[PDB]
Each structure stands twice: as structure tokens, then as C-alpha cells.
Design a protein around this ligand. Sequence first.
Ligand code: NAG
Lengths: 50, 50
Amino acid sequence: QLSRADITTVSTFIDLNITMLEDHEFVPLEVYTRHEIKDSGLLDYTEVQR
Amino acid sequence: YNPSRVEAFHRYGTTVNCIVEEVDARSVYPYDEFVLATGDFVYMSPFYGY
Ligand SMILES: *[C@@H]1O[C@H](CO)[C@@H](O)[C@H](O)[C@H]1NC(C)=O
């Protein structure tokens, strides 16, 4: 009696590798926050009047 | 300061109050002038010098 792995084996199937799409996490990103846009002005009427 | 009370007469009273303050100056490109926290414009480059 001999084991099943003692004889050479050939794959009769046509392998098809399937790599699922990895999960992705999106982080917040802004070129200029609303605070930066407000600060872009040279003068602010609110602060000047205050 | 105001003048003392003298009947049916106009009087002029001068008041001089020296004031010194620390203000945050701001400037934008080409940086040829800058403003102050009080809203006053200064037509001189912040980097002007000899
Ligand atoms: C992936 O597919 C290939 C054939 O494209 C196959 O040879 C391989 O054994 C498969 N599995 C792994 C883990 O690479």
C-alpha cells in the first residue's frame, strides 16, 4: 500500500486567480478650509469695527 | 478735558492723550504695502529699509 502523494500529480483544472478589491478609506481633504479663505482677505470689516 | 463754566460764552478745551498699541499687521503680494489691525493702510513695503 502506498500513499496518495507518492505518485506525481498534474493539475487537470485551468486555474483562475480572483483578487477581491481591497477596502479603501477616504480621509477629509480640502485645498483651503473655510477659515483660510476668510483669512485670505487683507482686511476684515468685522474685526476692524470691533 | 473741557473748559470751566463761564456764562453766555464759548470756550475751547484741548485734550491730548498719548496712545501706543500693539497691532497685527497684514500684507499680500507683491507686499508693497500693509494694513494694521485698526484698518489703517500703510503705503510702504514691510521690508523697506536702508
Ligand atoms: C493564483 O493564480 C495562479 C495562476 O494565475 C496560480 O498559479 C496560483 O497558484 C494561484 N494562487 C496563488 C496563491 O498564487
